[PDB]
């Protein structure tokens with residue numbers, strides 16, 4: 001595989017789309033690779049990690065409990081609710097909803113949690129409170145995945161997302177237990193995680209949240225590193241490409257391969 005930046009360029013050429021990427025040291029925030037890092041990209045499902053960070057902040061403040069059971073109705077469900085559609089009779093705890101949203105990409109679980117933090121406006125205010133003045137959520141699932149060209153709604157930038165993930169996982173803004181919980185939810189991805197692990201060389205740590213949208217939108221926020229350690233945050237977003245989902249997955253994997261083969265930088 002070629003050098004990271006060269007592979008990223010090759011992906012834009014082959015996809016006819018825009019790629020946004022940041023590779024950052026998790027412990028210190030040192031930026032290693034940055035491509036279109038300040039350009040906007042739809043967050044898609046990756047917003048769910050920030051959402052659960054806002055939920056954990058409420059738990060830390062005593063305004064929420066992960067144990068609290070929420071009962072909802074069938075009319076509250078939106079498209080793709082693999083876990084939440086199974087609990088119309090018994091409900092789900094707040095903690096279970098975050099696990100469903102992050103590890104199973106459950107859209108209704110995400111909307112139920114979004115309401116608890118004040119909706120899109122409330123989550124955006126949370127972002128502003130932790131110092132992210134760029135990322136914004138404006139809609140609910142599943143409209144937030146629309147990815148209209150030039151639409152600033154429901155977007156982030158690679159640099160803003162990486163910094164925000166770092167703040168939530170390591171800056172001590174969240175309690176130790178909350179930081180550990182957010183990390184574990186990413187480690188527990190039941191969809192993309194297992195497949196990625198199957199193709200990663202032995203010894204590489206992976207935790208992640210992936211997302212997809214219209215007009216070729218595709219992305220992943222991940223923790224990756226050799227020696228079975230979460231050494232770096234890697235954020236990759238793709239937008240405005242007419243390519244098949246398989247090809248978008250392949251290009252993202254190719255950028256990861258370039259990072260793995262040229263890790264010491």
Ligand SMILES: OC[C@H]1O[C@H](O[C@H]2[C@H](O)[C@@H](O)[C@H](OCCCCCCC3CCCCC3)O[C@@H]2CO)[C@H](O)[C@@H](O)[C@@H]1O
Pocket residue numbers: 001196199200201208220222224234236252253254255256257258260261
């Ligand atoms: O020299 C380094 C390695 O080169 C190959 O490994 C390949 C691997 O066989 C392939 O399956 C993977 O694809 C990349 C799989 C990455 C999938 C997701 C990437 C995501 C998640 C993490 C952040 C970026 C995006 O690339 C590596 C590097 O070439 C060899 O197979 C392996 O024995 C060797 O240790």
Ligand SMILES: *C(=O)c1cc2ccccn2c1N[C@@H](C(=O)O)[C@](C)(COC(=O)Cc1ccc(O)c(O)c1)S(=O)O
Pocket residue numbers: 044045046104105145191192195210211212213249
């Ligand atoms: C957010 O999670 C998301 C947003 C959208 C929008 C439209 C359709 C599907 N979306 C998802 N979820 C989806 C992705 O994030 O892509 C899930 C998590 C599935 O994914 C994968 O398909 C992961 C994957 C990648 C490559 C493969 O070869 C493979 O078998 C799986 S969800 O639909 O389960």
